[PDB]
From Swiss-Prot:
One of its GO terms (biological process) is maltodextrin transmembrane transport. It comes from the Bacteria. The keyword Signal applies. This is Maltose/maltodextrin-binding periplasmic protein. Disulfide bonds: none annotated. InterPro entries: Maltose/Cyclodextrin-bd (IPR006060), SBP (IPR006059), SBP_1_CS (IPR006061). Belongs to the bacterial solute-binding protein 1 family. One of its GO terms (cellular component) is ATP-binding cassette (ABC) transporter complex, substrate-binding subunit-containing.
Length: 421
């Protein structure tokens, strides 16, 4: 589908989509072409599902880590800005959206998590994770808690897991080794054990999610939280007097948040590629365009040099970049999705007691390193249960929705049907 003559954009609900729509209005006013902005739930999972059949938005916004998978599946159109335009954004942001030699998206913002604390409840935030238990005990005696953050998404817990040595994929020569995962090494175990101990010792609740953590902090119930710039807006309206700073250290090591580059990709099936290019290059990626988005929900640090250097005057932005500096820009390779799913499961199981820390991370390593991820395998079985044979078109479709190779799909089905007698 995807109607030619207009632009449909998808951006996560925690971002300034209303601000983005304002940029869209400007675009429509100048060009006459309508821009509709939508914020579907689980949009990063839905995109492959719809784009696999040539449908979906013309433009998709998400951190660069999901884009290598999309590009590998041929769901993203190559972008080719002139050197003049590329010079307007930091070289490392273009690097983040380069896959197999091709730029596959326009960098927008550089996202990194930071420690957010209530200045009135804690004028001096802890420098180490180790201090949190004792700090929490004190606050509890006052009917308050020390720390609350989303424990359901590995994005928020990864900074601690990686602090003492945990890593996603090993960067050997000049590439990531998809078979060398570091979610089960000494550093990862130490990090996760500390997190589980916090929950075990009633310093945090295993079911605390994004909404719960945000409500408690903006209510003055907890002294600290971990989140990104997009959340500053709601805190401002809460009147809570907060500060944004470097994340606590662990075992004397800095927390290492995975840094994401919020980027805009163009659907390979879009019949509005030139219009998408014009919108992104001439309207959004301008000081005026980004400011409009920022006004709705803070983008944090950005890729556009001219705007980043103005934002740099803001201490919350310096804090964001300081944390970004301590962590690392995440890989954009296809396997990142399996990685995230693996850590998500491990943290949830370790925190609930379904698995010991060692058992949880052992399974995480296997899951993240698997040639066919558990998610992909599950999808394959669902399809197989309905049809044990697929033609070329169907195989291509399944692969795209799957985030796996067409040959992988083909051989899996063959192996699945093999018999001996």
């Amino acid at each position: 589908k995807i109607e030619e003559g207009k632009l449909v954009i998808w951006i996560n609900g925690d971002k300034g989509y209303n601000g983005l729509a304002e940029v869209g209005k400007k675009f429509e006013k100048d060009t006459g072409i309508k821009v509709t902005v939508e914020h579907p739930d689980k949009l990063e999972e839905k995109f492959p599902q719809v784009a696999a059949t040539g449908d979906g938005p013309d433009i998709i916004f998400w951190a660069h880590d999901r884009f290598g998978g999309y590009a590998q599946s041929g769901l993203l159109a190559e972008i080719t800005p002139d050197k003049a335009f590329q010079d307007k954004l930091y070289p490392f942001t273009w690097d983040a959206v380069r896959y197999n030699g091709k730029l596959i998206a326009y960098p927008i913002a550089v996202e990194a998590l930071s420690l957010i604390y209530n200045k009135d409840l804690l004028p001096n935030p802890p420098k180490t994770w180790e201090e949190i238990p004792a700090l929490d005990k004190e606050l509890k005696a006052k009917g308050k808690s020390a720390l609350m953050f989303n424990l359901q998404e590995p994005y928020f817990t990864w900074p601690l897991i990686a602090a003492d040595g945990g890593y996603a994929f090993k960067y050997e020569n000049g590439k990531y080794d998809i078979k060398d995962v570091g979610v089960d090494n000494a550093g990862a175990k130490a990090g996760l054990t500390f997190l589980v101990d916090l929950i075990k010792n009633k310093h945090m609740n295993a079911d605390t999610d994004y909404s719960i953590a945000e409500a408690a902090f903006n209510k003055g119930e907890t002294a600290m939280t971990i989140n990104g710039p997009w959340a500053w807006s709601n805190i401002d309206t809460s009147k809570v007097n907060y500060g944004v700073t470097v994340l606590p250290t662990f075992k004397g090591q800095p927390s290492k948040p995975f840094v994401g580059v919020l980027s805009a990709g163009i659907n390979a099936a879009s019949p509005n590629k030139e219009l998408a290019k014009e919108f992104l290059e001439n309207y959004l990626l301008t000081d005026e365009g980004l400011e409009a988005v920022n006004k709705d929900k803070p983008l944090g640090a950005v890729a556009l040099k001219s705007y980043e250097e103005e934002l740099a005057k803001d201490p919350r932005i310096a804090a964001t970049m300081e944390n970004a500096q301590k962590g690392e820009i995440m890989p954009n390779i296809p396997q990142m999705s399996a990685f995230w799913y693996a850590v998500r499961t491990a943290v949830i199981n370790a925190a609930s007691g379904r698995q010991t820390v060692d058992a949880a991370l052992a399974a995480a390593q296997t899951a993240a390193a698997a040639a066919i991820s558990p998610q992909a395998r599950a999808f394959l079985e669902q399809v197989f249960r309905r049809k044990q044979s697929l033609n070329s078109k169907e195989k291509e479709e399944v692969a795209k929705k799957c985030g796996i190779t067409p040959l992988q799909v083909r051989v899996w089905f063959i192996n699945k049907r093999m018999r001996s007698k």
